[PDB]
């Protein structure tokens, strides 16, 4: 998260620290949120071999009792996810166990769009800045809804599909290390963290979790 401030600990229990790791490189990281005792929803790119799962942090480098690593059992990349256009950019992890509900840990549900000019909330644990690393504490930034003209830079963007999110005027934005993050407005995810500029420069990419609501329906009652 560029341009944020600190969230205040243990405010946004839903949401999951995802290591990622691959068999011929190092772990990468990325967010989600806890939308079932058992599952997490987050961005597909973030798949891997394996992937492990922390709730209830805040600061993530110290341990404390209200962490629950999780394992993870299974990965549900949308069938459609295309590496190229990065349409369908979207993933539920199924939890070896259901989580403890805690002050700390707890779900966020969304039912079954928001206009652009709405701001929104997002958190995360990602680089806040080109040349930096992740954030130790869990950050988050507020940033304005735009339309979708805002975003046709990036050639494959579609507006059914995506939301676009940050003001081009500020430095404000989510970034490396956020993806599969919670876009909130008004306290109803709307969105998760997808991809955006290598320079960090906004508006980024995010996923429009309404479109895919049914197909996360489909993965939870089948499974
Ligand atoms: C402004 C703005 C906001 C969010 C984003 S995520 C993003 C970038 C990205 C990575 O690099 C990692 C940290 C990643 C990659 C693979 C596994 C796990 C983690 C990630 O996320 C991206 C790459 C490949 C596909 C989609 C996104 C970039 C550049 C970016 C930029
Ligand atoms: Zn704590």
Not at 78 to 85: F, L, R
Not at 90 to 102: C, D, Q, V
Not at 112 to 139: E, H, I, N
């Amino acid at each position: 998260i560029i341009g944020g401030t600190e969230s205040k600990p243990h405010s946004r229990p839903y949401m999951a620290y995802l290591e990622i790791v691959t068999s011929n490189g190092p772990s990468k990281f990325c967010g989600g949120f806890l939308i079932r005792r058992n599952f997490v929803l987050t961005a597909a790119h973030c798949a891997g071999r394996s992937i492990t799962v922390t709730l209830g942090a805040h600061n993530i480098t110290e341990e404390e009792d209200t962490w629950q690593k999780l394992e993870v059992i299974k990965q549900f990349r949308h069938p459609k996810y295309n590496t190229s256009t990065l349409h369908h950019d979207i993933m539920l992890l199924k939890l070896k166990e259901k989580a403890s509900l805690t002050l700390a840990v707890g779900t966020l549900p969304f039912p079954s769009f928001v206009p652009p000019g709405r701001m929104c909330r997002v958190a995360g644990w990602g680089r806040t800045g080109v040349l930096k690393p992740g954030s130790d504490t869990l950050q988050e930034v507020k940033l304005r809804l735009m339309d979708p003209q805002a975003c046709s830079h990036f050639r494959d963007f579609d507006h059914n599909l995506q939301l676009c999110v940050g003001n081009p005027r500020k430095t404000k934005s989510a970034f490396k290390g956020d993806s599969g993050g919670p876009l909130l407005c008004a306290g109803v995810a709307q969105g998760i963290v997808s991809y955006g500029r290598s320079d960090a420069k906004p508006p980024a990419v995010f996923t429009r979790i309404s479109h895919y609501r049914p197909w996360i329906n489909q993965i939870l009652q089948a499974n």
